[PDB]
Amino acid sequence: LVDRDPIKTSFEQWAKPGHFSRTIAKGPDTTTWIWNLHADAHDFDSHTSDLEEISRKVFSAHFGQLSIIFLWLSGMYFHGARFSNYEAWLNDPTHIGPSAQVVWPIVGQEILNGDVGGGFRGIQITSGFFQIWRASGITSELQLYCTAIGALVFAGLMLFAGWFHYHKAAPKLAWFQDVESMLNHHLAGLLGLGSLSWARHQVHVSLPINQFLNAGVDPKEIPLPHEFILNRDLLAQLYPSFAEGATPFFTLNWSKYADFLTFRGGLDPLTGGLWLTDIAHHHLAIAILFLIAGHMYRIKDILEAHKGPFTGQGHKGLYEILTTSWHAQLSINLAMLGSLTIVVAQHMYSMPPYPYLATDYATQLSLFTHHMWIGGFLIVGAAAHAAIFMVRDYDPTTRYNDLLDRVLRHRDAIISHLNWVCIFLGFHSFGLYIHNDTMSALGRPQDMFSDTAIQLQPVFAQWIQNTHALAPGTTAPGATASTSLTWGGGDLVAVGNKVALLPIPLGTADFLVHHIHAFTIHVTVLILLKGVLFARSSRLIPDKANLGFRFPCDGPGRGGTCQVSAWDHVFLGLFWMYNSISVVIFHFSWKMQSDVWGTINDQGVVTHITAGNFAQSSITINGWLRDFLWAQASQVIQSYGSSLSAYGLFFLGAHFVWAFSLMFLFSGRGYWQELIESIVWAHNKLKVAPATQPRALSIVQGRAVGVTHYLLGGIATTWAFFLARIIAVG
Amino acid sequence: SDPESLRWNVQAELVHSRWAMLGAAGIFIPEFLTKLGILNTPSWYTAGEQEYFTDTTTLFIVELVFIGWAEGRRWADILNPGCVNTDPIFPNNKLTGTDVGYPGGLWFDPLGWGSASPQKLKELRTKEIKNGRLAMLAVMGAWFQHIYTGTGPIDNLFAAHLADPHATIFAAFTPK
Amino acid sequence: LAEDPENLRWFVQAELVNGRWAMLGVAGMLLPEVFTSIGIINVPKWYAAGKEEYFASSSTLFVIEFILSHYVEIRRWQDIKNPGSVNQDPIFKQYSLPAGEVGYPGGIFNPLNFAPTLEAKEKEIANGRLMLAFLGFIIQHNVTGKGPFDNLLQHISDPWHNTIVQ
Amino acid sequence: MRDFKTYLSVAPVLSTLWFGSLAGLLIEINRFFPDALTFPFF
Amino acid sequence: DIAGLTPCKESKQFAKREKQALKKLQASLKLYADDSAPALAIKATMEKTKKRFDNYGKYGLLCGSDGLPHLIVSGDQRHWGEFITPGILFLYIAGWIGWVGRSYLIAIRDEKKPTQKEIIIDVPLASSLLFRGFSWPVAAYRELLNGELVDNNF
Numbered sequence A: 001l002v003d004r005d006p007i008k009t010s011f012e013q014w015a016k017p018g019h020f021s022r023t024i025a026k027g028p029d030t031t032t033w034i035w036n037l038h039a040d041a042h043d044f045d046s047h048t049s050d051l052e053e054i055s056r057k058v059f060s061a062h063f064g065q066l067s068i069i070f071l072w073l074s075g076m077y078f079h080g081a082r083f084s085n086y087e088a089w090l091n092d093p094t095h096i097g098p099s100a101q102v103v104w105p106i107v108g109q110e111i112l113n114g115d116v117g118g119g120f121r122g123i124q125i126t127s128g129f130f131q132i133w134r135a136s137g138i139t140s141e142l143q144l145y146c147t148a149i150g151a152l153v154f155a156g157l158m159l160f161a162g163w164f165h166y167h168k169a170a171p172k173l174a175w176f177q178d179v180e181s182m183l184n185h186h187l188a189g190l191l192g193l194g195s196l197s198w199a200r201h202q203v204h205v206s207l208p209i210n211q212f213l214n215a216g217v218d219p220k221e222i223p224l225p226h227e228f229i230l231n232r233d234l235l236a237q238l239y240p241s242f243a244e245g246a247t248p249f250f251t252l253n254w255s256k257y258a259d260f261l262t263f264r265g266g267l268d269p270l271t272g273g274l275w276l277t278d279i280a281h282h283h284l285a286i287a288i289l290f291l292i293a294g295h296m297y298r299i300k301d302i303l304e305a306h307k308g309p310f311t312g313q314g315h316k317g318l319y320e321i322l323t324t325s326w327h328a329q330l331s332i333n334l335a336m337l338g339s340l341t342i343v344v345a346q347h348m349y350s351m352p353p354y355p356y357l358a359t360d361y362a363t364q365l366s367l368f369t370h371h372m373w374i375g376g377f378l379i380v381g382a383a384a385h386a387a388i389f390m391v392r393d394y395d396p397t398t399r400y401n402d403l404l405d406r407v408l409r410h411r412d413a414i415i416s417h418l419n420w421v422c423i424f425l426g427f428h429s430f431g432l433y434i435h436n437d438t439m440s441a442l443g444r445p446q447d448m449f450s451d452t453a454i455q456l457q458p459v460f461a462q463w464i465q466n467t468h469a470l471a472p473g474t475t476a477p478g479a480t481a482s483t484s485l486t487w488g489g490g491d492l493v494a495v496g497n498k499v500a501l502l503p504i505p506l507g508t509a510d511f512l513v514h515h516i517h518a519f520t521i522h523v524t525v526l527i528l529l530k531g532v533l534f535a536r537s538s539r540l541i542p543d544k545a546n547l548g549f550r551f552p553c554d555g556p557g558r559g560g561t562c563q564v565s566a567w568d569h570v571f572l573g574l575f576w577m578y579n580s581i582s583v584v585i586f587h588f589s590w591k592m593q594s595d596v597w598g599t600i601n602d603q604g605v606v607t608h609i610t611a612g613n614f615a616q617s618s619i620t621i622n623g624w625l626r627d628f629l630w631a632q633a634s635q636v637i638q639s640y641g642s643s644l645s646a647y648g649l650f651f652l653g654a655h656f657v658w659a660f661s662l663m664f665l666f667s668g669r670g671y672w673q674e675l676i677e678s679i680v681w682a683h684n685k686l687k688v689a690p691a692t693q694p695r696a697l698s699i700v701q702g703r704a705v706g707v708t709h710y711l712l713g714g715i716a717t718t719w720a721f722f723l724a725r726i727i728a729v730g
Numbered sequence B: 001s002d003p004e005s006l007r008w009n010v011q012a013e014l015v016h017s018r019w020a021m022l023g024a025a026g027i028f029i030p031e032f033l034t035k036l037g038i039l040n041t042p043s044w045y046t047a048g049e050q051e052y053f054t055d056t057t058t059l060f061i062v063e064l065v066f067i068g069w070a071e072g073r074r075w076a077d078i079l080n081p082g083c084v085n086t087d088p089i090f091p092n093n094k095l096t097g098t099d100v101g102y103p104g105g106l107w108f109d110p111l112g113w114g115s116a117s118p119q120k121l122k123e124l125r126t127k128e129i130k131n132g133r134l135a136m137l138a139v140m141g142a143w144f145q146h147i148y149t150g151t152g153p154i155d156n157l158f159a160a161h162l163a164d165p166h167a168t169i170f171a172a173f174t175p176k
Numbered sequence C: 001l002a003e004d005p006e007n008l009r010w011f012v013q014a015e016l017v018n019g020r021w022a023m024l025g026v027a028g029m030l031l032p033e034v035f036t037s038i039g040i041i042n043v044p045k046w047y048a049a050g051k052e053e054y055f056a057s058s059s060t061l062f063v064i065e066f067i068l069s070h071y072v073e074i075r076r077w078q079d080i081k082n083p084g085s086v087n088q089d090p091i092f093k094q095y096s097l098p099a100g101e102v103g104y105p106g107g108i109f110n111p112l113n114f115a116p117t118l119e120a121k122e123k124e125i126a127n128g129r130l131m132l133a134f135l136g137f138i139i140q141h142n143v144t145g146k147g148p149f150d151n152l153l154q155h156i157s158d159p160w161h162n163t164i165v166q
Numbered sequence D: 001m002r003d004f005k006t007y008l009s010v011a012p013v014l015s016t017l018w019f020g021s022l023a024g025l026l027i028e029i030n031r032f033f034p035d036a037l038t039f040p041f042f
Numbered sequence E: 001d002i003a004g005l006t007p008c009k010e011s012k013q014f015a016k017r018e019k020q021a022l023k024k025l026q027a028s029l030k031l032y033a034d035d036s037a038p039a040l041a042i043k044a045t046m047e048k049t050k051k052r053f054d055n056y057g058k059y060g061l062l063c064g065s066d067g068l069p070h071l072i073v074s075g076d077q078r079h080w081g082e083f084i085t086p087g088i089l090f091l092y093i094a095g096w097i098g099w100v101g102r103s104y105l106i107a108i109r110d111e112k113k114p115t116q117k118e119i120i121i122d123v124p125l126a127s128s129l130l131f132r133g134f135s136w137p138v139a140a141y142r143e144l145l146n147g148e149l150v151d152n153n154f
């Protein structure tokens, strides 16, 4: 370390066994430290006992994400370009069924490459470029081929800002350890100056270049590469060059107008992607705020303020150490970032924001479950990293007697409640279904819980849905339809290939899933809540912050003394959430196809991918493999010899990989030792082993190779199960 | 703050160099030489226009039986005797090292003054134009590029195309 | 331990038997080349004696000889663990007794010996290989061919043939 | 520059320039003979 | 010849496979490439699995019912190199994977501190002990069982 510290060598450290705590990787050989090294590679209890750097690394090794997201996207714009189908698909939507990727016909490959639209062999897409891409106030294949290198530009450069940190002799403390302004900036002008800037390049150019696309043409029979300058003459069709107004204000006359916007709500008949005549106004109406907003402020003051009786004395002082944490100001974030992603996953499917979605079924549910697993994979995290706080981050105990020191005060308490909450749920929240089986398999419907047997009567309606689609008669101005076409009141006519959204009815078989979610969302959180709370000390172990937030398990005593910790609460809390999301998905498509998705023809006699089979028959939790899993999936297990086939052909692996997790999840440890030697023996006889003491998995590594597999198994299983029942009918 | 960054053979890279480059000599002067309009013409009838082809891949064999032979003999007794094991003198060997070759065996050696010194003076000559030849040929090997790319009409491959003025290739000069 | 070799006995005798049988093997070919015309596999039979009986078979022939070769060969065994073969000119060579500056062990490179008059098992060294690798050669080229060298009319110049098999 | 009795080192995963490639040259034999399931010989 | 049927010289069931199945491949009356220069079902992918006509070579190859071809390899009638030919091959290749396993290993445990030289690699692949494998004529087939790895060391 020790090596040359000094002052006295540019000469870099390539060669001399080890580094990472101090009777380190020792001279003496071993393997464990090769999963060490990668694991905990990023961490901070080592590197130095002194903040300083760390924030000087994380602001750099951050960077290389943007740059990456940036090398990525490029190979997607390039891809969504010269491996074309976008040109072809756009003159010809409702019709196509898009591609970007294609094999090369090496070995078996080609089956994977199967006629997708504007006349070519390839593998489809459920990742709605070709639909952000509607945008292109321009169109052209080589063009995206500029947007593309425009991408690699931001990268190399927005990747030499990461040389232009840590490796360059760095900023320091004040720079972040004065926080005083940060959000001031961020939200004001980027949050703002994007949404803002996005406005300017969202009616300028895009609106017009799909105002007269929503009809016909073949591009360049429209939208030149410059055309949209000073020429405010084509902006003539889509409202005035302000005619006699000057910089809004009022001494304005309308005997017949009101600038672009003229607010919509509903859905283009010919392109139901929601109206764009709005899409400017809403982004404009954003930015303003941010534009005004990012103009606080300088900190404590506002939190150093409102206290009460039982309230939070420490509210006041809610962390000096919120300029001195990270692990704290990351975990907070993840809960939001994360919880603020799966709020996407709704406003999307019950309010499409891109031209051609809904009709495009599979190219926005992929979405609504990809976005859905982040608004969850980022939340258990958002707990883990709080545990990482709760255990260690600060130097000593300087933080004292406050909102927390409070919450903890009760702790065998906040989690005392929550518990019973769950068993109240569960009993009202799952055995509920099991009634049905036991009594519908007993069979007496009189007494089930059907949308019709237990008292509810051919209506759901009177709640709040029915006071949403109907609200354009309040303080409400209006604009034909609602806000989200899926609401109770009025309207039908949505689309001329297939369908899109319509009411979406409820009652029971909507009533009780909606409740299983409760109990599922709740017991998830119990285990993370109590997990992060009891982070450091307890009446099973108090001497219990003494290593780190991991540690395998304290020891055979006290009865059990194993799981405890909170790596592990963030190990069995993943375990749930994989359900939390994995059953919410299961919900949406079985609805969204049992009803909604389906299809018009004469007299628009609606014909769902399934005549609402849901009805009386998800209520039975077998119906959930009678009507689901065994019904759909018949497309997965038919999928051989085709074009997609890579799904069925995954769906066996990964429906294997999962069923390999249990081995990592379910087993001892001096076991594979006791085994690894028999091995090590046979090894020595030929003279072939010892060097680098081969060793079994690091108790908790073992759990690391559970879980992670159990998910990348149990998950892509459906990622396959899905793309295979929306491609092809649906 | 400056790379770390290398070598050591930093000593050997420099002798496929005098290999690569001197060598490009062979192409540089014979080409242009060629001999414009010699009088003229290039015609080779002789072993070549009637005995069923002459070479191509008996070409190589004979062709680099020799290069064969000689390129090997080239670096692998450039010099290095001692020629085995077992502790470090670095290059990745000099496991010849402290012994050149032989303790009083034969005339391993060239030349008096117990070494191999091809005398002291001659930095001249080959420091200059020669590790020139390295440099030179960088840019009239960057001519190889200019000299022909553009696959004289007789083929557009993967049709961008991508605009059009007029042709290109070689013979000397330039429109400009 | 046995630093290194070794061996000895070993497979130097290993060779000479290759050497001197690759030599013979090629006497095989020698024949059909001057006053030429008659060989390849020619799966002989192999020179074939009298007009007084065989007749396709009378017998496996071929199969026998080498039952014989067989105990004569145990015999050369019957030598090399423990040195016994009067002449004694393979196991090290003749020149009676000697060479075995490698019979009790300790070689490294050990060149050897063995003609009284005179010289050596040496330039019977290199007819030694010429012929092993020759065969390599010999039943290399069949698998497409079977004949050498005319004059400068139109032969030695390789005209057109036909892959490997493929 | 490398003579006799082992040489210079190399990284953690030069196996990722050994899985990719070498092995990679082998698709390169699995299209030259675009097919197997027995094989002619040479 | 053996349990399944005969090779390619005739195999009815096999024929039907050639034909429907692939050729439906077809299946696309057109699908546009009248002259067009990409969409390559058209040329080979079929013809490369196809011009594989009433020839595949000829390989014998037994072919059961549904006429997918079965592998006997019992060293008889025709089928010998469906295991041995590609069998010794598997042997020879491996073993010269681990002959050198027991090599860029038995070359270290010595000199000075040799305690993980192996997480980096001294000669990459060994590129020194390299050919020791093709430069196995006989080799371990004697010197493994006599000396070195000698029962001693056993």
Ligand code: CLA
Pocket (backbone or CB within 6 Å): A038, A039, A040, A041, A042, A043, A044, A330, A334, A377, A378, A379, A380, A381, A382, A384, A388, A567, A570, A708, A712
């Ligand atoms: C803003 C977020 C983000 C950031 C910057 C971090 C940063 C950090 N986390 Mg963290 N974390 C996050 C989100 C984040 N996390 C989330 C959402 C969770 C919930 C799962 C966690 C759960 C978590 C735990 C339990 C731990 C950390 C730890 C850490 C620290 C260790 C980093 C490391 O060595 O990489 C770790 C990554 C590897 C070693 C790479 C292995 C990745 C495998 C599992 C592959 C994943 C599957 C994928 C499909 C495989 C690729 C495809 C393949 C099939 C080809 C580091 C400070 C660790 C710590 O000890 O604190 C100091 C502790 O282990 N995190």
Ligand code: CLA
Pocket (backbone or CB within 6 Å): A678, A679, A680, A682, A683, A686, A688, E097, E098, E100, E101, E102, E103, E104, E105, E121, E123, E124, E125, E126
């Ligand atoms: C060079 C290496 C080498 C050699 C000679 C062997 C040899 C052996 N192993 Mg083994 N093994 C190895 C590496 C090796 N292993 C590695 C890396 C692992 C992963 C931990 C194992 C895991 C393993 C297990 C679990 C078992 C064996 C067993 C055995 C024995 C049975 C052979 C068998 O069927 O397993 C086939 C061989 C493997 C599964 C090993 C995979 C690794 C190979 C591919 C190493 C390839 C070389 C590698 C790249 C080194 C780099 C080269 C370097 C010089 C630059 C045999 C003695 C079995 C036993 O004990 O019974 C006698 C037992 O079941 N091995």
Ligand SMILES: CC(=CC=C/C(C)=C/C=C/C=C(C)/C=C/C=C(C)/C=C/C1=C(C)CCCC1(C)C)/C=C/C1=C(C)CCCC1(C)C
Pocket (backbone or CB within 6 Å): A069, A189, A190, A191, A193, A194, A195, A197, A198
């Ligand atoms: C520099 C600038 C700018 C700008 C502008 C800008 C600066 C803009 C920006 C914007 C931003 C944005 C617009 C954002 C975006 C984002 C995104 C797009 C993302 C997305 C996502 C999500 C959702 C999550 C994650 C994933 C992803 C990434 C996909 C300018 C400046 C200036 C100056 C000083 C001078 C004068 C002029 C001006 C102008 C005044």
Ligand SMILES: CC(=CC=C/C(C)=C/C=C/C=C(C)\C=C\C=C(C)\C=C\C1=C(C)CCCC1(C)C)/C=C/C1=C(C)CCCC1(C)C
Pocket (backbone or CB within 6 Å): A652, A653, A654, A656, A657, A712, A715, A716, A717, A719, A720
């Ligand atoms: C047997 C095998 C395999 C298997 C396999 C299986 C049997 C399975 C696997 C699986 C894998 C995976 C699976 C991975 C992956 C992936 C991915 C890419 C994913 C993605 C995703 C995302 C993005 C997230 C979530 C969802 C998903 C999953 C979709 C192999 C074997 C072998 C041999 C003989 C020897 C040598 C080597 C090899 C050649 C290797």
Ligand SMILES: CC1=C(C/C=C(\C)CCC[C@H](C)CCC[C@@H](C)CCCC(C)C)C(=O)c2ccccc2C1=O
Pocket (backbone or CB within 6 Å): A663, A664, A665, A666, A667, A668, A669, A672, A673, A696, A697, A698, A699, A701, A702, A703, D015
């Ligand atoms: C199966 C199992 C094992 C045994 C699993 C092992 C030993 C997996 C590790 C195997 C390594 C990854 C093989 C690595 C070898 C190769 C990387 C070396 C050759 C390099 C390549 C070229 C092949 C545990 O150690 C364990 C520990 C704790 C709880 C549960 C379990 C558990 O369930």
